[PDB]
Swiss-Prot record, chain A:
Forms a heterodimer with XRCC5/Ku80; heterodimerization stabilizes XRCC5 protein. Component of the core long-range non-homologous end joining (NHEJ) complex (also named DNA-PK complex) composed of PRKDC, LIG4, XRCC4, XRCC6/Ku70, XRCC5/Ku86 and NHEJ1/XLF. Additional component of the NHEJ complex includes PAXX. Following autophosphorylation, PRKDC dissociates from DNA, leading to formation of the short-range NHEJ complex, composed of LIG4, XRCC4, XRCC6/Ku70, XRCC5/Ku86 and NHEJ1/XLF. Signal peptide: none annotated. The gene is XRCC6. It is found in: Nucleus; Chromosome; Cytoplasm. The chain holds residues 306 to 356 of 609 of the full protein. Induction: In osteoblasts, by FGF2. The modification Phosphoserine is found at residue 1. This is X-ray repair cross-complementing protein 6. It comes from the Eukaryota. Belongs to the ku70 family.
Swiss-Prot record, chain B:
This is X-ray repair cross-complementing protein 5. Individuals with systemic lupus erythematosus (SLE) and related disorders produce extremely large amounts of autoantibodies to XRCC6 and XRCC5. ADP-ribosylated by PARP3. The gene is XRCC5. Heterodimer composed of XRCC5/Ku80 and XRCC6/Ku70; heterodimerization stabilizes XRCC5 protein. Component of the core long-range non-homologous end joining (NHEJ) complex (also named DNA-PK complex) composed of PRKDC, LIG4, XRCC4, XRCC6/Ku70, XRCC5/Ku86 and NHEJ1/XLF. Additional component of the NHEJ complex includes PAXX. Following autophosphorylation, PRKDC dissociates from DNA, leading to formation of the short-range NHEJ complex, composed of LIG4, XRCC4, XRCC6/Ku70, XRCC5/Ku86 and NHEJ1/XLF. (Microbial infection) Interacts with human T-cell leukemia virus 1/HTLV-1 protein HBZ. The EEXXXDDL motif is required for the interaction with catalytic subunit PRKDC and its recruitment to sites of DNA damage. The chain holds residues 62 to 183 of 732 of the full protein. Belongs to the ku80 family.
Length: 51, 112
């Protein structure tokens, strides 16, 4: 609202679902999609007739 | 605990409360189910709840047509049921052409 110049930390991320806004940090979104370190984890074996 | 049902005549239709009607779900209902761990230790019936649900479905399907009308059940089935009408509800559900799906707790028949 002043022109000027915004900077990475001067902004948030949001989604407006229905009639309500939800606000998160960049790192919050980047983190909520975290489950594991890279690499495969063996989950047992299955026949090549079921897939 | 009580009975705030839209229809409740006499002894039947008790310990049942139709919490919500048919409109757009928002964080209001999500909060409401997020904070309703209360027992309300008065177990009466389960079929009456489904009958009231389908009846209010027919009641509030005015000005808003629905292509698929759905009802889900979650009951321990440990309370005594009611046999007031069964064929009548079967006929009313066939004429309403709605396909219910029944869900049940862990009781089907180590660290589960």
């Amino acid at each position: 609202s002043t022109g000027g110049l915004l900077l990475p930390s001067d902004t948030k991320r949001s989604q407006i679902y229905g009639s309500r806004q939800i606000i998160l940090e960049k790192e919050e979104t980047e983190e909520l999609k975290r489950f594991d370190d890279p690499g495969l984890m063996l989950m047992g074996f299955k026949p090549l007739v079921l897939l | 605990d009580g009975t705030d049902n839209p229809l409740s005549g006499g002894d039947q239709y008790q310990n049942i409360t139709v919490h919500r009607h048919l409109m757009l779900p928002d964080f209001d209902l999500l909060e409401d189910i997020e904070s309703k761990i209360q027992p309300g230790s008065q177990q009466a019936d389960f079929l009456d709840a489904l009958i009231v649900s389908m009846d209010v479905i027919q009641h509030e399907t005015i000005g808003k047509k629905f292509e698929k009308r759905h009802i889900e059940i979650f009951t321990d089935l440990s309370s005594r049921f009611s046999k007031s009408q069964l064929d009548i509800i079967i006929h009313s559900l066939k004429k309403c052409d709605i396909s219910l799906q029944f869900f049940l707790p862990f009781s089907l028949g180590g660290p589960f």
